[PDB]
Design a protein around this ligand. Sequence first.
Ligand SMILES: O=C1/C(=N\O)c2c(-c3ccccc3)cccc2N1Cc1cc(F)cc2c1OCOC2
Length: 346
Amino acid sequence: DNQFYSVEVGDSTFTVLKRYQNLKPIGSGQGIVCAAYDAVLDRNVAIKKLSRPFQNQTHAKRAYRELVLMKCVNHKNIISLLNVFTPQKTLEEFQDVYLVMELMDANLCQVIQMELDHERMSYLLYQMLCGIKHLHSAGIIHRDLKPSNIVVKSDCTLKILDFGLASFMMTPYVVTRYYRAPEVILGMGYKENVDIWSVGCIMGEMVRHKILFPGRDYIDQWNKVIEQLGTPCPEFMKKLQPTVRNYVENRPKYAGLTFPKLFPDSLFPADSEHNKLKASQARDLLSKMLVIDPAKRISVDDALQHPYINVWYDPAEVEAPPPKQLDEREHTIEEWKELIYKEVMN
Ligand SMILES: O=C1/C(=N\O)c2c(-c3ccccc3)cccc2N1Cc1cc(F)cc2c1OCOC2
């Protein structure tokens, strides 16, 4: 009884189970994340305070889907939830849910601010591809991969924090866009390889150390794509809805730079012969992920047989047994609060 203590972290009051102490801020922009020491298990952990998760239809959707999927997905590349809890005793008073997962050492955003060997890089990308494969094998297509959402460990191990996209909010937080596939941006329908674009957008950033296609708006973002990759072909546009197709066909045309140009040798570690051979396969593999047309873009499995990637292939790691409930859903606040609380108490 009374296993909770309140403590002011940042601008917030973290009320948590006694077992967790010396809490440090490591997130405001996951949102109110916090590093801790779990006295019981005797390791460090990450806790996340979902302030009033039922407060809107979006939050409630994200929080519900976060909750269920983390319970019944065990892959070494998808962040492990260890513990869920609420400080409040009753559904009437029920206000906050704290998620406790295991801790890594850093953002993928930090990793991007540094030179890596092809071994570390081929490893990270391998792992991203695994996690993604599991997700796809369980019918889950992500659609929103991003550095801020992939965490890494000193020994090169890597996890993904969210299960991505499943309408509107008012925050001081603008959603990041630079990693979203053309087929999603143009709202043309999609299949699993759609996260392959997102994977490539990262690889290229790792390699360039600058966000490939930045951009204030979905309009400005698409300028910056074709600017580099070139206007897509006829076959591609034969698929975009007449209303979209119009905007898209009537656009300053681009020849677009062939891959060697976009990614010079300057950017690659390539001074030993191993490094040079490697670089070329990095670029062959980049050349295939960064493809606007999903029709002609590389599948998830082929990516894992790619000469660069497959140096780490593992049947256990890749082809793990597939992971419940319908998840395309609608409810109101008092029903969402109902369903989040049920999922906590379990
Ligand atoms: O490792 C995590 C992490 N969960 O493991 C994590 C989470 C997280 C973890 C579990 C559940 C929800 C969010 C959110 C944001 C960052 C995370 N990071 C990155 C991170 C770790 C760390 F020990 C110190 C810092 C780190 O990043 C910024 O720089 C300081």
